[PDB]
Write a protein that binds this ligand. Structure first.
Ligand SMILES: [Cl-]
Ligand SMILES: [Cl-]
Ligand SMILES: [K+]
Ligand SMILES: [Mg+2]
Ligand SMILES: [Mg+2]
Ligand SMILES: [Mg+2]
Ligand SMILES: [Mg+2]
Ligand SMILES: [Mg+2]
Ligand SMILES: [Mg+2]
Ligand SMILES: [Mg+2]
Ligand SMILES: [Mg+2]
Ligand SMILES: [Mg+2]
Ligand SMILES: [Mg+2]
Ligand code: NA
Ligand code: NA
Ligand code: NA
Ligand code: NA
Ligand code: NA
Ligand code: NA
Ligand code: NA
Ligand code: NA
Ligand code: NA
Ligand code: NA
Ligand code: NA
Ligand SMILES: [Sr+2]
Ligand SMILES: [Sr+2]
Ligand SMILES: [Sr+2]
Ligand SMILES: [Sr+2]
Ligand SMILES: [Sr+2]
Lengths: 81, 46, 65, 194, 119
RNA sequence: GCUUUACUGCAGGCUGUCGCUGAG
RNA sequence: GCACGGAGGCGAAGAACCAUGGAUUUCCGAAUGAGAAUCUCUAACAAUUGCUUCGCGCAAUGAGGAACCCCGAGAACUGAAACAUCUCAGUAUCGGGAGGAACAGAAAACGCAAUGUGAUGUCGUUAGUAACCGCGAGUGAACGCGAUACAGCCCAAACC
């Protein structure tokens, strides 16, 4: 049984998305849909997911850009891991 | 061209294999990446 | 290591699953620290977590859950 | 006294005379409209079928097959040949039509094994044969003392290897003495000269 | 059809089957084309029945002529399964023979007579 | 490789005959 | 692990390692719900069959394997100092199919002709003999015998 979230994608671009747009980025299983990524993220960090953009990477993986609701704070979420 | 998801996975792998033999392997084996490819000089499959 | 087979067999089906979710989380947080280039690692545990999970999963199948 | 079976037999010694003549003339009209392989609930020549091993039991199947009459349907050489190997018209195949019929039937029923077959006539352009096939996987057969032998693994696809009665005859294995120097134990072991 | 040279009325066929059913309960009867054939050959047969829906026809084609040269009377039935039912079988019967009736000799005799007349 | 009234054969076409094929 | 690094970890709760058995076992692949360059689309023995509770309910087939084996299709260079029959050769190659080995096999045999042998392979021999053949070049057995191993049975029908 493959899991959805593989690990946080942490790079300069990710940090900006986190500080400026309340977005979190993850390396996820390429078989995962935007919806499955949303659910997984909410169930793992107890947050509300507003939008999910995806991209199949030239590393053979899928990257997800998850925007959280204004109710949540990406910076704080990512900081506890 | 237009790459499918699988084609893309294969290209990605080829790119990964194009890295070098890590430094530590040198010390450990007390002393080359034979599959070193170049985008221009070589030709991948498909 | 820290987690032995007896202990796993002594757990109830509910304890194994809870223990499973717990280990999966520690692992996820480890891979996050690693992805963040975090050095406060312990390469041994990241490896142990995988085995522990395989053990629990192996035990779950054996006991019928 | 004579069996009723002997009467079917005696009728078929002269398929062109008596009632049998009229039956065939009638039947072939329908046969000509059927396909290459038609499963039939009952053998047309009961005496012959039972004689060859047929039984009214589960796992026993009978099918009629039609094949074109005549010699080999061969293509003329597209490359160099010495006069000897340029023939086309008078070349005939080495397997008789009955054998070809047995194989077609067996291909139609992949899970069944050919037990035996017999002829049921012909018209001016085709020949019909009826083939008895057995289901080696049905318990009614695995328990039959007279047919269970055909369930053995080495009997799989027996028809395709010439293990059929028509196969053995066509391979020149009928004679146990003179004339069978190149046929027994196999055409192949004898360098294919039989 | 090729062995049937005359048609038997639905009613005559009715009497024959009834007579056959009482023949098994009283007298003796043979079930099957083989047993029927031997009865005719051994001469131990009084009345033989022959279904008309037999396929292949080779199974019973011989009954008619074999019966004639043995003086044994014979009659046709339309359905194969009725003869088998009448003969007391759970299956069908291409042919049947009343080997010495029983409390039906009278009727069986009439039937034979009604047939000869029916040509 | 090509040619032809070179040698020898092979397709193909025409034609007879037998089978399919029966009644007066 | 190969592989002698750094860091770190595991092992007396007896690890490593080895044997046996079990668990897990992505996607494509005979590939089987439909499609596709290993992915996708909306519950699946696809297809062909047997049985059948006539419902994919129960089953079979498919593809692989170094060669060996059985059944089919079947050349030419070459030899003949040319070449056509012949030869190369039922070889190369092709189609189909089984097994651990295949195939053959209990006489409508043999025919050292006999007051004789007694299923079948195979090995040695019989023998380059008999036989074939532009009677050229070439091709080429068998019975028997000495061995190996041995094993003989079941239906159809008659009568029920
Ligand atoms: Cl077969
Ligand atoms: Cl002898
Ligand atoms: K030649
Ligand atoms: Mg996109
Ligand atoms: Mg790079
Ligand atoms: Mg018996
Ligand atoms: Mg052999
Ligand atoms: Mg598919
Ligand atoms: Mg020459
Ligand atoms: Mg020759
Ligand atoms: Mg010469
Ligand atoms: Mg030769
Ligand atoms: Mg001899
Ligand atoms: Na990764
Ligand atoms: Na290139
Ligand atoms: Na078959
Ligand atoms: Na030239
Ligand atoms: Na495995
Ligand atoms: Na199947
Ligand atoms: Na079904
Ligand atoms: Na020469
Ligand atoms: Na020459
Ligand atoms: Na010659
Ligand atoms: Na001697
Ligand atoms: Sr990269
Ligand atoms: Sr170039
Ligand atoms: Sr097969
Ligand atoms: Sr019936
Ligand atoms: Sr012996």
């Amino acid at each position: 049984s493959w899991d959805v979230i593989k690990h946080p994608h942490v790079t300069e671009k990710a940090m900006n998305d986190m500080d400026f747009q309340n977005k979190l980025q993850f390396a996820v299983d390429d078989r995962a849909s935007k919806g499955e990524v949303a659910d997984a993220v909410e169930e793992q960090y107890d947050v509300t997911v507003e939008q999910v953009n995806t991209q199949n990477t030239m590393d053979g993986e899928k990257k997800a850009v998850v925007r959280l609701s204004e109710d949540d704070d990406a910076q704080e979420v990512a900081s506890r891991i | 061209g237009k790459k499918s998801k699988a084609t893309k996975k294969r290209l990605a792998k080829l790119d990964n294999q194009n890295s070098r033999v890590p430094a530590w392997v040198m010390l450990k084996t007390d002393r080359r990446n034979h599959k070193r490819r170049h985008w221009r000089r070589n030709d991948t499959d498909e | 290591t820290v987690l032995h087979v007896q202990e796993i067999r002594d757990m109830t089906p509910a304890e194994r699953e809870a223990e499973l979710d717990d280990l999966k989380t520690e692992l996820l947080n480890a891979r996050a620290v690693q992805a963040a280039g975090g050095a406060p690692e312990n390469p041994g545990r990241i490896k142990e977590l995988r085995k522990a999970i395989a053990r629990i999963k192996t035990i779950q199948g054996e006991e019928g859950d | 006294a004579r069996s009723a079976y002997s009467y079917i037999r005696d009728a078929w010694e002269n398929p062109g005379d008596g009632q049998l003549a009229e039956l065939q003339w009638q039947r072939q009209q329908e046969w000509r409209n059927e396909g290459a392989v038609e499963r039939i609930e009952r053998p047309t020549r009961l005496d012959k079928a039972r004689s060859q091993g047929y039984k009214a039991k589960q796992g026993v199947i009978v099918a009629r097959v039609s094949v074109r009459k005549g010699s080999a349907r061969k293509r003329r050489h597209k490359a160099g040949r010495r006069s000897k190997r340029q023939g086309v018209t008078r070349i005939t195949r080495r397997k008789d039509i009955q054998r070809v019929a047995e194989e077609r039937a067996s291909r139609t029923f992949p899970n069944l094994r050919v037990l035996n077959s017999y002829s049921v006539g012909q018209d001016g352009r085709q020949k019909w044969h009826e083939v008895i096939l057995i289901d080696p996987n049905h318990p009614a057969i695995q328990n039959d003392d007279d047919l269970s032998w055909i369930c053995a693994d080495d009997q799989a696809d027996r028809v395709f290897r010439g293990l059929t009665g028509a196969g053995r005859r066509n391979r020149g294995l009928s004679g146990k003495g003179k004339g069978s120097e190149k046929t027994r134990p196999s055409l192949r072991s004898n360098g294919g000269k039989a | 059809p090729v062995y049937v040279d005359f048609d038997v009325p639905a009613d005559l066929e009715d009497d024959a089957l009834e007579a056959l059913e009482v023949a098994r309960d009283t007298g003796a009867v043979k079930k099957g084309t083989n047993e029927t054939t031997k009865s005719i050959e051994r001469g131990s047969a009084e009345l033989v029945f022959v279904a008309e829906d037999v396929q292949p026809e080779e199974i019973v084609m011989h009954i008619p002529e074999l019966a004639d040269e043995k003086g044994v009377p014979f009659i046709f039935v339309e359905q194969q399964d009725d003869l088998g039912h009448a003969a007391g079988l759970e299956v069908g019967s291409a042919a049947a023979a009343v080997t010495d009736a029983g409390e039906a000799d009278a009727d069986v005799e009439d039937i034979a007579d009604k047939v000869e007349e029916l040509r």
